[PDB]
Amino acid sequence: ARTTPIARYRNIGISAHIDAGKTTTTERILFYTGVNHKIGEVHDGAATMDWMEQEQERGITITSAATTAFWSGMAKQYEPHRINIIDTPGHVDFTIEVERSMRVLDGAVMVYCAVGGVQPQSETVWRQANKYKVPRIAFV
RNA sequence: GGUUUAGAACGUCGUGAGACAGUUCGGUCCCUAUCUGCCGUGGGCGCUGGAGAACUGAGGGGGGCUGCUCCUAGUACGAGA
Ligand SMILES: Nc1nc2c(ncn2[C@@H]2O[C@H](COP(=O)(O)OP(=O)(O)O)[C@@H](O)[C@H]2O)c(=O)[nH]1
Ligand SMILES: [Mg+2]
Ligand SMILES: [Mg+2]
Ligand SMILES: [Mg+2]
Ligand SMILES: [Mg+2]
Ligand SMILES: [Mg+2]
Ligand SMILES: [Mg+2]
Ligand SMILES: [Mg+2]
Ligand SMILES: [Mg+2]
Ligand SMILES: [Mg+2]
Ligand SMILES: [Mg+2]
């Protein structure tokens, strides 16, 4: 019946300020879980998550897209876990898209830039996570 | 080709010959370079015995243009765009 045990289920989000690396990291994820053959890049318009024509041209993610993957581990330590990743926009123009997605997700990976780190949308998403009380980790 | 010759016509002006910052069709453009100038190219003598060569370099000239793509770098700046 159930393909993967519920314990081997991660529902995660990638919310962060604009150009924090949220979309690129999902591409590196789709690469290091083998689900995507090419690493890709947003400026080239290559990123899969940005499927919308506008998102390709502007490089912006104007919608949240959800994808899943199986990362057994870095040493194949665990049986493959199905990570449900909901990549989100960080443009305050689209704020529902992060919150619409946020209640559903069980955990949050909040990206930050090493040059800037907390930048204004970053506080905005932090506040959103606190309202849905997602337990959080961070990728700088 | 135009402009302003001789032909012809139109509109207009004049009685007319003709004329018009009116138009229209047609209508012959010569010169073997003496001098300067310039581009090349030599002959003479000179540079202090004659010759063969290799140079130095005053000075003179030539040349000096730029696009696009990628890279730095989606980096600086920018809440973003
Ligand atoms: N230098 C550098 N650039 C990165 C890194 N991660 C992402 N980027 C660039 O940041 C820009 C925007 O990243 P993206 O993930 O589209 O931004 P987001 O969609 O707003 O998270 C893209 O040009 C990426 O190439 C990184 O680790 N280093
Ligand atoms: Mg951009
Ligand atoms: Mg994005
Ligand atoms: Mg003529
Ligand atoms: Mg005659
Ligand atoms: Mg006549
Ligand atoms: Mg002649
Ligand atoms: Mg010179
Ligand atoms: Mg010169
Ligand atoms: Mg670039
Ligand atoms: Mg625009």
UniProtKB/Swiss-Prot annotation:
Superkingdom, taxonomy of origin: Bacteria
Cellular localization per UniProt: Cytoplasm
Binding-site list for GTP: 16-23, 87-91
Residues annotated as signal peptide: none
The family this protein is said to belong to: Belongs to the TRAFAC class translation factor GTPase superfamily. Classic translation factor GTPase family. EF-G/EF-2 subfamily.
Biological function: Catalyzes the GTP-dependent ribosomal translocation step during translation elongation. During this step, the ribosome changes from the pre-translocational (PRE) to the post-translocational (POST) state as the newly formed A-site-bound peptidyl-tRNA and P-site-bound deacylated tRNA move to the P and E sites, respectively. Catalyzes the coordinated movement of the two tRNA molecules, the mRNA and conformational changes in the ribosome.
Descriptive protein name: Elongation factor G
Source species of the chain: Escherichia coli (strain K12)
Top-level taxonomy: Bacteria, Pseudomonadati, Pseudomonadota, Gammaproteobacteria, Enterobacterales
Parent sequence residues shown: 2 to 141 of 704
